[PDB]
């Protein structure tokens, strides 16, 4: 494998301070299995998504399952096998900073992640041991498939 | 962190500036060590990068080779930044309250 | 010893380039190869970034002491 995260979520707002913009939705989300929140992006006129909507989202360090990092480039014409096949909306990506919860002042376990996919923002919040394998300057493929 | 900017603040290049100056980064490098320490004694990291979960370390990240171009690259900003002999600097006086 | 800056001013900066093409614009040796310029200034920037130009630059102290350095010897910068 080459997985980072994978967690099933559930959107529990939709546009926190009103709709700023058309196309982008600041989604606000909570983790079923870990006590994860998310916000996150995404582009809601290709891909819709609904204030009850529950999905399953993996971050990646590659798309290929076969555990190979060659990305020199990337072809969007190339067709074989893919994590892609199995998921409705990917996206790529930089980690660009890793940040300490400041609402304790002793004995804290949560941590910061922030991805940008080129200016749509991710952040990841959660217990360190969860967040495993980000690093700062490091390149991921979000993915995301909705559930019935 | 303090052990290894004095190793290198002690080298014969740094004798050529200001001694405000030097006090200033001396006094700026002890401000990002308290940070340090702040966050380890916050997330029980131990110093020796034994702990288990590495994203720690990621928190208050400082290397050697980052701290030695820190220190160049501010001592060379700081001496390139002198008025240059020369220069005709009432001229740019009078011109920069005139305007 | 030498107590004046190392670094090139730009006033000596612009004064060495300027008194050696108006020197290469004279017939003087040129002593770098240069490689189809015709400019007079081009081939002085050539040979200030090989060092190869032959100035001293005599920094005066305003007492009447002097200091003279190379050109080749002083740290340049843009």
């Known amino acids: 494998a080459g997985i980072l995260f994978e967690d099933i979520f559930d959107v529990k707002d939709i546009d926190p301070e009103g709709k700023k913009f058309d196309r982008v939705s600041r989604l606000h989300c909570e983790s079923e299995s870990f006590k994860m929140d998310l916000i996150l992006d995404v582009n809601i006129q290709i891909y819709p998504v609904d204030l009850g909507d529950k999905f399953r989202l993996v971050i990646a360090s590659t798309?290929?399952?076969?555990?190979?990092?060659?990305?020199?480039?990337?072809?969007?014409?190339?067709?074989?096998?893919?994590?892609?096949?199995?998921?409705?909306?990917?996206?790529?990506?930089?980690v660009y900073r890793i940040e300490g919860d400041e609402t304790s002042t002793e004995a804290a376990t949560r941590?910061?992640?922030?991805?940008?996919?080129?200016?749509?923002?991710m952040r990841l919040q959660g217990d360190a041991n969860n967040l495993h394998g980000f690093e700062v300057d490091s390149r991921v493929y979000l993915l995301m498939k909705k559930l019935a | 962190l303090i052990l290894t900017t004095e190793s290198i603040m002690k080298k014969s290049e740094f004798l050529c500036c200001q001694d405000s100056f030097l006090q200033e980064i001396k006094k700026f490098i002890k401000g990002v060590s308290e940070k340090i320490k702040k966050t380890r004694d916050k997330y029980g990291i131990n110093d020796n990068g034994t702990t288990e979960p590495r994203v720690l370390y990621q928190l208050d990240r400082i290397t050697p080779t980052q701290v030695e171009k820190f220190l160049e690259t501010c001592r060379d900003k700081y001496m390139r930044a002198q008025m240059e002999p020369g220069s005709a600097v009432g001229a740019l006086c009078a011109q920069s309250i005139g305007e | 010893k030498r107590i004046?800056?190392?670094?090139?001013?730009?006033?000596?900066?612009?004064?060495?380039?300027?008194?050696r093409a108006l020197q290469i614009a004279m017939c003087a040796p040129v002593?770098?190869?240069?490689?189809?310029?015709?400019?007079?200034?081009?081939?002085?920037?050539?040979?200030?970034?090989?060092?190869?130009?032959?100035?001293?630059?005599?920094?005066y102290?305003?007492?009447?002491?002097?200091?003279?350095?190379?050109?080749?010897?002083?740290i340049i910068t843009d």
């Open chain 3, 61 to 74: 102290l305003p007492d009447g002491s002097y200091e003279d350095w190379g050109v080749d010897e002083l």
């Open chain 1, 63 to 94: 798309l290929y399952e076969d555990g190979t990092l060659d990305d020199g480039e990337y072809n969007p014409t190339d067709d074989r096998p893919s994590r892609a096949d199995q998921f409705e909306y990917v996206m790529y990506g930089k």
């Open chain 3, 31 to 59: 002593m770098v190869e240069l490689e189809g310029e015709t400019d007079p200034l081009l081939i002085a920037m050539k040979e200030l970034k090989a060092r190869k130009i032959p100035i001293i630059i005599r920094r």
């Open chain 3, 4 to 19: 004046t800056t190392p670094y090139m001013t730009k006033y000596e900066r612009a004064r060495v380039l300027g008194t």
């Open chain 1, 111 to 121: 941590l910061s992640a922030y991805v940008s996919y080129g200016g749509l923002l």
